[PDB]
Design a protein around this ligand. Structure first.
Ligand SMILES: [Ca+2]
Length: 223
């Protein structure tokens, strides 16, 4: 997250870190057994880390649970990042508590202009590299479809939305991928892609979760 703030320990209790020996992507806990992330975050050998604040210090509220299964969307296209969504099933259910909690899936798509909370352990620099240890947060508004298409011509599908600030300076970034965009208390986006981070006229692009709720529900009913 570039231009964000330190969230505060466990104040984003559905944020998970995906670890393969190191943190490599975020995700969102949607119930005691399942995490939503980006398909471009797929790796074999994922351990889900819930209850994290500092990802480099064991502080006492973590749960570390191996994935048993990952399920990339059936139409994921890694060239365009259309359908950039994945489900990860935990080998055992998380213990839900005040610091480890699920986030609701949406019933309706979010409104352009809505300010949403984006969070992660990604790079905090637009030019250069600095990865924080503690969770960072950003409030960013959803941009109109026509602004998002103007920013990335020929690349935005109906399964993507932009959010952020066209003047630059505030964005998600590498290492935030897979994590949540929460708007009015629902998971509406997944950190997906963008040109650089926090660059003028190049806002973040997010997977539009409200288009996937029937897939998510039938997949978790079947696995
Ligand atoms: Ca920790």
């Amino acid at each position: 997250i570039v231009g964000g703030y330190t969230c505060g320990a466990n104040t984003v209790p559905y944020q998970v870190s995906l670890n393969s020996g190191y943190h490599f992507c975020g995700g969102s806990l949607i119930n005691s057994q399942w995490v939503v992330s980006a398909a471009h975050c797929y790796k074999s050998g994922i351990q889900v880390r819930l209850g994290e604040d500092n990802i480099n210090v064991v502080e006492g509220n973590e749960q570390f649970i191996s994935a048993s299964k990952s399920i990339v969307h059936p139409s994921y296209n890694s060239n365009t990042l259309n359908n950039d969504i994945m489900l990860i099933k935990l080998k055992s259910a998380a213990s839900l508590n005040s610091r480890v909690a699920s986030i609701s899936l949406p019933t309706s798509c979010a409104s352009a202009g809505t300010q949403c909370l984006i969070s992660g352990w990604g790079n905090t620099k637009s030019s250069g590299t600095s990865y924080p240890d503690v969770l960072k947060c950003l409030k960013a508004p959803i941009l109109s479809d026509s602004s998002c298409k103007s920013a990335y011509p020929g690349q935005i599908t109906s399964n993507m939305f932009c959010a952020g600030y066209l003047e630059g300076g505030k964005d998600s970034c590498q290492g935030d991928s897979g994590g949540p965009v929460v708007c009015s208390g629902k998971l509406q986006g997944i950190v997906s892609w963008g040109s650089g981070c926090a660059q003028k006229n190049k806002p973040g692009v997010y997977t539009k979760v409200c288009n996937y709720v029937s897939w998510i529900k039938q997949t978790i009913a079947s696995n």
